[PDB]
Amino acid sequence: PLSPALQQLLSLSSQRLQLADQVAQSKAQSGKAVQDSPREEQQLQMLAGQAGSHGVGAEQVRLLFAAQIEANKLVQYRLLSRPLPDVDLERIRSRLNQLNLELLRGYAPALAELRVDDCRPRLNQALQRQVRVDRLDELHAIALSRAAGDLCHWAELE
Amino acid sequence: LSPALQQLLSLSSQRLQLADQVAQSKAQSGKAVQDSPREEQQLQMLAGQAGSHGVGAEQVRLLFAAQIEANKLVQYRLLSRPAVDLERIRSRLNQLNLELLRGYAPALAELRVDDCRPRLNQALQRQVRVDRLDELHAIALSRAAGDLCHWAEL
């Protein structure tokens, strides 16, 4: 079966985690930690507050974005842990906000596509398809599976 | 060799090698990778023991949040591509957590240096080479190390 809304969610997720590479460059210079727990909590609270104007639950939104943020972090930690191949943060932030809003806009139809008896198959096929579309390397492919998290379970929350 | 740090990473490596068996369990049981109540209960259980192991409560939460996330990223990956005694696996994880906690203070001391990321990165690759970690598990090990360099100066 087709799962277009899911495929969209994953394309957005792919774009978002691809920004990690540039964040990791920023942080090799600023000395800033990959993780900022208060800041991440604040972001989750702000995104959850938008759930009602996109037809989804607050908790569903916090779960989605916690997974997005973790996907981003695992790329950053890996890149900082090896030699860097060798950044405008305001442009990164504006791209993040745009992608976040598109994720919110697409989340309710993706959750509806997931409320099926073959969710894991559909998810796995959509992940592999996205990896192939975006020519993701192994690190970024791992990140994408991380960004999808437990979507199959989150679909059956509400 | 930075030996305490090396041992902290070896213990991390051992812990994240169990993720493969947790993933198998969940493939068969249908349980979610993530269980937020369970994870928070674990972080509370361990952070409360910080003082007795010569470290701070926040340092301990940070370490174990990274351990748990490292485990989760292996599980999600394995479930996304093509029998386990879970009570035994979770017992082994418990033993590894206690070993991590005892080894934490001496590792943090080794990280209070002006070349922390070079030492960390060399320790990470050494561990990858010694344990023959594949790319997934090497990535997971970098995740487990997290922001150790920053946590050492809390």
From Swiss-Prot, chain B:
It holds the Pfam family CM_2. The lineage of its organism: Bacteria, Pseudomonadati, Pseudomonadota, Gammaproteobacteria, Pseudomonadales. NCBIfam families: CM_mono2, PRK09269.1. The gene is aroQ. It comes from Pseudomonas aeruginosa (strain ATCC 15692 / DSM 22644 / CIP 104116 / JCM 14847 / LMG 12228 / 1C / PRS 101 / PAO1). Pathway: Metabolic intermediate biosynthesis; prephenate biosynthesis; prephenate from chorismate: step 1/1. Substrate binds at R15, K26, D35, E39, Q75. GO terms for biological process: chorismate metabolic process; L-phenylalanine biosynthetic process; salicylic acid biosynthetic process. Its main location: periplasm. Keywords: Amino-acid biosynthesis, Aromatic amino acid biosynthesis, Isomerase, Periplasm, Phenylalanine biosynthesis, Signal. This is Monofunctional chorismate mutase. It is an enzyme of class 5 (isomerase). InterPro entries: Chorismate_II_sf, Chorismate_mutase-related, Chorismate_mutase_periplasmic, CM_dom_sf, CM_II_prokaryot.
